[PDB]
Structure 1
């Protein structure tokens, strides 16, 4: 709808920064709306979804098992480690760590998961082999959140992420059991309250992953639809604004309110 685009433009005016936007039909993969679709934005914590997609790919092939227990130490703990800092004694399974990475955005969990697959480059190789020659992860947490302007490291485009997400959630890449583990983790997101979730009517489905970085970076990827069943993918990124966090949260909410009302 023109008026959802108008809200994206107004959000650009009021934040004083670039905003990338993609609305994708889950069934056919056709783009319903777009704004700056081929411009790069920092992925920030939204990459954790693509990371757990790579891990589930290894689980399918038998190179990884969801129950394998990983033991680490305080050393591996990096800033924002809400769950991993509580399991220094018993360790955590791959399944629990991916749950921590997506539902709580645990940073140490992400670094541990990156180690099991062979580092950021090997995640990029994973995305490359499924048809994403645009998205790239280059650094570990928390360095990947610097969001230096014009730096292409740890970036995606609204169109590339939205298509890759669609393949991960509904494509032929993962098995049915693996596809549902990723969507279940995303549905259990507990850190994207004031974003798209704030504008959701009762009975709607949402499975999302949010993120923020430096230089006013904020973003969300989401699978949502009415009556508890997803039907579209929404990708929203922004960077460059000197806005406070609560301000950036407000615009993504108004973008959410618009596309829900003109669903």
Structure 2
């Protein structure tokens, strides 16, 4: 375990940025932590908590996921690959959740945040799960500014890994809702170059990526290797320069270091 820490510190030094890692290995409950109690801007990885809040709401409101939401041209923001195909049409809350999680559609995320009552309502759902660190302050895309020292829209790798474990494997959601969140994350289309690129190809992975200002490049994942116990992995990364380019390769390298 002294070797894995040295490897992460060296990966961080070579990258020029700030790396946050939290690995929970459910096989023995061991953890690998690197800046796991420091805050980082979640960017689009916050979409997991917004979809989960709607899933929690659906437990006491039958057929909530079938409720329809109109998409208007005025709702469109910087990245809406699914919503832009439904302008003057409607999408169900299930379709918005799938679009937010699988394509990282920002309009879909804003509909989810709005549905639960706004950013503070998403934060309140996090508190109800025992997550005292997560905070959602803004909507998409301003929640992705990732200004160094700004606590808005941040969490810690430790907090997010524990929450992701509670959501996907634990009892934070009702059985059906947990299975639905797992199905949505397994269907993600945006993660091939991030955590997944550091893992054996055959491993079943559910993840949610994100990126923002200051070259912020993130990924959160539940990993299920065949015939093994699952792992929960959060890899957050940020850089000194406001217009730095993304570093998905750093997340892949970190995933390989902590899983070898």
TM-score range, shorter chain: over 0.9
CA contact (8 A) 2:41 2:153 kept: yes
Q: Using the TM superposition, give the Cα deviation of residue 64 of structure 1 relative to its aligned residue in structure 2, in angstroms.
A: 6.2
| TM-score (normalised: structure 2) | 0.94
Q: What are the equivalent positions in structure 2 for 1:53-72 lying under 5 Å apart?
A: 53-62=52-61, 65-72=64-71
Hey, what's the Cα distance between the residues in 2 that align with 1:180 and 1:220?
Answer: 20
Superposed structure 1 runs of 4+ greater than 6 Å apart: none
Where does residue 15 of structure 1 map in the other structure?
A: 15
Q: Using the TM superposition, give the Cα deviation of residue 250 of structure 1 relative to its aligned residue in structure 2, in angstroms.
A: 1.5
Where does residue 189 of structure 1 map in the other structure?
A: 188
User: Structure 2: 5+ residue runs without aligned partners?
Assistant: none
CA contact (8 A) 2:102 2:189 kept: yes
Where does residue 88 of structure 1 map in the other structure?
A: 87
CA contact (8 A) 2:8 2:257 kept: no
Where does residue 34 of structure 1 map in the other structure?
A: 33
Count the aligned residue pairs.
258
Summarize the Cα distance change of 1:170–1:213 in structure 2 as closer, same or farther, 3 Å threshold: same
- SS of 1:133's equivalent? coil
Hey, what's the Cα distance between the residues in 2 that align with 1:211 and 1:221?
Answer: 9
Deviations 1:87-118 (A, max 9, x none): 11321000000000000000000001111100
CA contact (8 A) 1:19 1:35 kept: yes
Are 1:176 and 2:175 matched, yes or no? yes
Where does residue 115 of structure 2 map in the other structure?
A: 116
CA RMSD of aligned residues (A): 1.7
| TM-score (normalised: structure 1) | 0.93
Are 1:50 and 2:49 matched, yes or no? yes
Hey, what's the Cα distance between the residues in 2 that align with 1:27 and 1:203?
Answer: 19
Hey, what's the Cα distance between the residues in 2 that align with 1:230 and 1:65?
Answer: 33
Where does residue 220 of structure 1 map in the other structure?
A: 219
Q: Using the TM superposition, give the Cα deviation of residue 176 of structure 1 relative to its aligned residue in structure 2, in angstroms.
A: 1.1
- SS of 2:89's equivalent? coil
Where does residue 250 of structure 1 map in the other structure?
A: 249
